[PDB]
Amino acid sequence: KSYTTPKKNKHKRKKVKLAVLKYYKVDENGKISRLRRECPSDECGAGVFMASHFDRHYCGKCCLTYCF
Amino acid sequence: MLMPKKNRIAIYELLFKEGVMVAKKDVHMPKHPELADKNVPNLHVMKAMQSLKSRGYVKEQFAWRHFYWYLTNEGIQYLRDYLHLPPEIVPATLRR
Amino acid sequence: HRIRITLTSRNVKSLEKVCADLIRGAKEKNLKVKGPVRMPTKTLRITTRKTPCGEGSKTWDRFQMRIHKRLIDLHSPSEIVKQITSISIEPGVEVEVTIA
Amino acid sequence: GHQQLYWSHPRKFGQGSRSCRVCSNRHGLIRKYGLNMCRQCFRQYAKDIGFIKLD
Amino acid sequence: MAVQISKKRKFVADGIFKAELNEFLTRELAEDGYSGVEVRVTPTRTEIIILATRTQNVLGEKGRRIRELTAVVQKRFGFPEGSVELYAEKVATRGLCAIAQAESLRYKLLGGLAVRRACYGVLRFIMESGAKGCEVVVSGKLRGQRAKSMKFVDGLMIHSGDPVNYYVDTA
RNA sequence: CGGAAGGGCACCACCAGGAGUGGAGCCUGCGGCUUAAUUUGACUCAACACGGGAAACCUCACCCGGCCCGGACACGGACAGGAUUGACAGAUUGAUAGCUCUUUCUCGAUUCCGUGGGUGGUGGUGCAUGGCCGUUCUUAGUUGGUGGAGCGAUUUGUCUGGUUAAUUCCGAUAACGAACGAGACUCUGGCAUGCUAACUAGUUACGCGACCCCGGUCGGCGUAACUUCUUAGAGGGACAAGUGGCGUUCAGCCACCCGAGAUUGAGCAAUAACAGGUCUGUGAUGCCCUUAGAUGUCCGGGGCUGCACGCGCGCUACACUGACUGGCUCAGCGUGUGCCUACCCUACGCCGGCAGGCGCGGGUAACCCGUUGAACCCCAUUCGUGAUGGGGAUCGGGGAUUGCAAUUAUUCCCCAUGAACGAGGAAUUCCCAGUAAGUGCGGGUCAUAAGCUUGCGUUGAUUAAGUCCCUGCCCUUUGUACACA
C-alpha cells in the first residue's frame, strides 16, 4: 500500500582512501611521528590508535573516553 | 551471516573431527552445548551448516528439537581442501 | 554386608519372574535372605482431551501408567550380590543396588 | 545496541518461556512429570512412552 | 546420581527417550526398512538392537551409518564415550510386520505404482507370507479433487476389546 | 418419509418424585455496539467454564512506532590504494536501538549492490487433504462364498412364533458354511482369620518410664513371634449353581435357602457416510499471497476484561432444619527439588492480629509434610421473623506475597460502607442405590491462581422396577409423483 511518512535511509558508509596515511608523519630521516594517541588498554597495547575528535578522545571497541 | 573466523574454524574443525554433528533448534543460545569452550552460538552453527547443506555437501535429519547432519565424502574433500590438511588422517566416524 | 536391592518395573509378571529368580539364586547360594517386600504401586494418571481442537462433545482420556517397586535385603558381601545381579537381566526391571 | 535489545526479555517464567518438545508451540503443554509436550503429540506418542488406557 | 532424579520422572523420561528414538529412526531409516528398536540398560553400558529388514542398507559401508547413529545418540543424549552400542538385526517373517508393509506401500506409491495394483500386490504378498487377515485403508485424493477412500479387507480381523491391543498390529 | 398399522427399546423421553435453570447478585463464554485493536474458529442435539483459552510480559495471530536478516546457494560488478560489521559522547529517540544527523576510530574477505532462487508465515483455503475427534448409532445392526427366485437392478440365508440389554438362543425353514459387532476381553470394588512376604506399615506379649486410685492410658522408647488391621502376587470364589412355580418343557423368566456379591463401573467397540471441527499442534502437506518500508523475527505500550442490551454453563443466598462463637471428632485419589528451566512439598522456633519474614532440619518419596488432626455433622451460649447477627454486590483507607512491570484494584489479610434477593412465569436439565443432592480434599491451567474441569472422601435419601402418552431409535407390512431423500 501507499505510504505518507517517508522511510529512514541507510547510513551511507563514508569510505576513506588510505586511512593509514593520516596516522603518521614522515621525516626524511629514519623516524616516525605519532599524531593520534595510542590506547593504553590491555586488549590493545600499542597497535591501535584512538579517534582524534574536536573536543575529546575516544577508543571504540574498548569504549575508553578521555575528556579535557 | 558475518561470522568470526575463530568460531568458523572451530565449527569446521568439530565437523572434521566428527562428520555427523547435532544442533538444537534455538536461535537464542549463547553457547553451543557440546563445545562449551569457545563462544560458538547456535544460530551461527545452524546457519553455517545450512550454508553447507544448500550447496549439497551434507545430509539433513530432524527429531523434534534437533537438526542432525551426516557429512558425505564430498564434504570430507571440501573440508580437507579448506583446512589444507593431509589426506592420511581420517574422521572418527570411519574408524575401525 | 546388609545389601539392598530395589526392583522397579512397569510390567507385572516380568517383575515377578525377576524377583523369583533372585529368590532362587539366593536360596541356591545359601545366604540369610529376607522376604521380598512390596511397596505400594503407583498409577500415573493423565486426563487430556480426545479431540485435538475443542469442537465436539467433551470427552476425556484416562492414561494410566502402573509402576511397581519391590525390595530384597541380603546378608552377604558385595561380590555375591554383583554375581547374582549380573546374570539374567531384562529391560522391564530396573535394579538399584545399595551397599549400606 | 542490537545485541542489548535482541534478548532483553526475562524468560524466567510464564507459558511462553516453556514450550512443547515436538511442536514447540505454547498451547496445551503437559508439564506434568517432565513431559513438557502438547496434548496432541502426547496422544500420538502415548503408546511409545508407555501410557495405556486401562480404565 | 548426583542430581538424584526421581523414579516418577525417570520412567517418564525413559518413555520420552524411547518415543524420540523411535521417531528418529523411523524418519532416518525409512528408505531402508525400519521396524523397531529394543533397548537394554546395564551398569556402565547400554545395548540396543535395531530391528530392521535390509541389514546391508542400514549398515552401509562397513558399519559407517551405524557409527554415525552411535555418534548421534552420544552427542544428543549426553552419553559417555563407548557407553552405548547399537546392533542391527534382520526381521524374521517381515510380512506380518504392519509398519514394514506400510513403508513398502508408501515407497511404492512414491515410486509411482498405481493404488489398486499396489494394494493388490501388498495384500498378495502378506497372504503369501501367511496372516490371519488384513485391512488396507488408503485415504486421500484419488482421480480428482474429491477425497476417495479405499478399503481392501479379507480374512479374520478383530476390532474391539482388549485383544486389539496386542493381537493385531496397526500402522 | 407418513399427524399409516403391528411389536420392542431409551430418565441425552414420560409417569411418580428428588435437586435445579429461567427470578436477584457475581464469574466465564457468545451475539450486538463503540473503538487504532476490542485477533479468531464454532451457531440445535453434535457451538456458547469449548480450542485444555483462569491472556499485565510471552502466548498474540490485532493496532500504534522503531531494530535486524536469521534473503541459503548460483550468476554479473566492487575491493586489499580495503568487500563490509561494531562504536561512548552532543540533537533525535522510549531504551545506555551508531535507528538516524556533524566528527572520526575499529572488524578483516565471513561480507555488499542487482538478477534467478530458497527459507519463514497462529496469512487465506477443513469445499484439496492426511491424521485425530464428534455424530449418524448405546442402539443392534453389517458383509462375503456356494446354492435357489427373478431378463435385470435385487431377494433368500439376514425369520412365522417364544425369549434376551443384544441378528442372544430354541424351533420351523431354499438354504448351508461362515465373518465383524454384541457377547467374549482388560482394569477397577467389596469374599479370603488359607499361601508368599515385610525395620520405608502395624498387631500381641514383655523390659522400662510418667500419671490416677491390683487395675487403666500413653503415635514415649526398644525387642520374641505374626500378618488380623497395611500393601501387592499366584490364586480361588458365581455359574441361573439348588429348590418351588410359568413357559413347545427347548430357548428362557420370577421368588427363595445357603451365601460378600444371584444385573458395579470404565476402556475397546462392526459396514458405510457426514462437503461436521482442526491449515491457530507439527520442520504432516498441496494451491494462492507476502518476502526487506515483510503477513519472517524482536523490542515498548495498549487490547483480547471495554457496555443502554439478550442468551448459555456455573458459584452465593433468599434463612430458626439457620447465622455467629468455643469444645469434640473422622479419608483417599493424589502431588512434591525440573536438559533448556532460571520455578518443589514443608516439620519446628522466634517477630506480628493478619497476609507473611527470618534460621537451621527432612524428603527424588509407604522414610518428610502426615496417624494426612478437611468440611457437613455432634454438644453448650448469643439471636427472635426485622431484608435481622441471612446474604455479601458495590466502594474508601491500609498492610504483605509472586513478578522486570499491577494502572483497568494480579492474589491474600484488617476495618468500614451494606444493594437486589421473601422459593422465581412460559419453558427446560439430570437421575433411580452408596445413586441424586449437601460437603470438603488432590492433579491440569500455576512465578503469583479454581467462581472451570478431572479424580477422591464424608453424610446420604424420596419415588419407580412400567410405558409409547411427548421426544427419538430399531425389525415387519403398506403408500410415494422424494432420492442435495
Curated annotation (Swiss-Prot), chain A:
Covalent link Glycyl lysine isopeptide (Lys-Gly) (interchain with G-Cter in ubiquitin), residues: K25, K31
Post-translational modification remark: Monoubiquitinated at Lys-25 and Lys-31 by RNF25 in response to ribosome collisions (ribosome stalling): ubiquitination promotes subsequent activation of RNF14, leading to EEF1A1 ubiquitination and degradation and rescue of stalled ribosomes. Deubiquitination at Lys-31 by USP16 is required for maturation of the 40S ribosomal complex.
Disulfide pairings: none
Locations listed in the record: Cytoplasm; Nucleus, Nucleolus
Zinc finger motifs (C4-type), residue ranges: 39-62
Region described as Disordered: spans on this chain: 1-13
Positions of post-translational N6-acetyllysine modification: K22, K31
General function of this protein: Component of the 40S subunit of the ribosome. Part of the small subunit (SSU) processome, first precursor of the small eukaryotic ribosomal subunit. During the assembly of the SSU processome in the nucleolus, many ribosome biogenesis factors, an RNA chaperone and ribosomal proteins associate with the nascent pre-rRNA and work in concert to generate RNA folding, modifications, rearrangements and cleavage as well as targeted degradation of pre-ribosomal RNA by the RNA exosome.
Subunit annotation: Part of the 40S ribosomal subunit. Part of the small subunit (SSU) processome, composed of more than 70 proteins and the RNA chaperone small nucleolar RNA (snoRNA) U3.
Protein name: Small ribosomal subunit protein eS31
Region of the whole protein represented: 83 to 150 of 156
UniProtKB/Swiss-Prot annotation, chain D:
Record organism: Oryctolagus cuniculus
The protein's name in its UniProt record: Small ribosomal subunit protein uS14
Name of the coding gene: RPS29
Family annotation (InterPro entries): Ribosomal_uS14, Ribosomal_uS14_CS, RIbosomal_uS14_euk_arc, Ribosomal_uS14_sf
MF GO annotations: structural constituent of ribosome; zinc ion binding
GO CC aspect terms: cytosolic ribosome; cytosolic small ribosomal subunit; rough endoplasmic reticulum
Single Gene Ontology BP annotation: cytoplasmic translation
NCBIfam families: PRK05766.1
Source taxonomy: Eukaryota, Metazoa, Chordata, Craniata, Vertebrata
Similarity-based family: Belongs to the universal ribosomal protein uS14 family.
Swiss-Prot record, chain E:
Enzyme Commission identifier(s): 4.2.99.18
Modification N-acetylalanine occurs at: A2
Modified residues (Phosphothreonine): T42, T70
Notes on how activity is controlled: Endonuclease activity is inhibited by MgCl2 on apurinic/apyrimidinic DNA but not on UV-irradiated DNA.
UniProt GO BP: apoptotic process; cell division; DNA repair; positive regulation of apoptotic signaling pathway; regulation of translation; translation
Asymmetric dimethylarginine PTM sites in chain numbering: R64, R65, R67
GO cellular component terms given for this protein: cytosolic ribosome; cytosolic small ribosomal subunit; mitochondrial inner membrane; nucleolus; spindle
Transmembrane intervals: none
Membrane disposition: Peripheral membrane protein
N6-succinyllysine, modified sites: K132
KW Phosphoprotein (keyword) present: yes
Domain of life: Eukaryota
UniProt keyword annotations, A-Z: Acetylation, Apoptosis, Cell cycle, Cell division, Cytoplasm, Cytoskeleton, DNA damage, DNA repair, DNA-binding, Isopeptide bond, Lyase, Membrane, Methylation, Mitochondrion, Mitochondrion inner membrane, Mitosis, Nucleus, Phosphoprotein, Ribonucleoprotein, Ribosomal protein, RNA-binding, Transcription, Transcription regulation, Translation regulation, Ubl conjugation
Location of cross-link Glycyl lysine isopeptide (Lys-Gly) (interchain with G-Cter in ubiquitin): K90
Compartmental location: Cytoplasm; Nucleus; Nucleus, Nucleolus; Mitochondrion inner membrane
KH type-2 domain ranges (all copies): 21-92
Phosphoserine PTM sites in chain numbering: S6, S35, S104
Single Gene Ontology MF annotation: class I DNA-(apurinic or apyrimidinic site) endonuclease activity
Tagged with keyword Ligase: no
Assembly mode: Component of the 40S small ribosomal subunit. Identified in a IGF2BP1-dependent mRNP granule complex containing untranslated mRNAs. Interacts with HNRPD. Interacts with PRMT1; the interaction methylates RPS3. Interacts with SUMO1; the interaction sumoylates RPS3. Interacts with UBC9. Interacts with CDK1; the interaction phosphorylates RPS3. Interacts with PRKCD; the interaction phosphorylates RPS3. Interacts with PKB/AKT; the interaction phosphorylates RPS3.
Family note: Belongs to the universal ribosomal protein uS3 family.
The protein, known as: Small ribosomal subunit protein uS3
Organism of origin: Oryctolagus cuniculus (Rabbit)
Shown chain mapped onto the complete sequence: 1 to 171 of 243
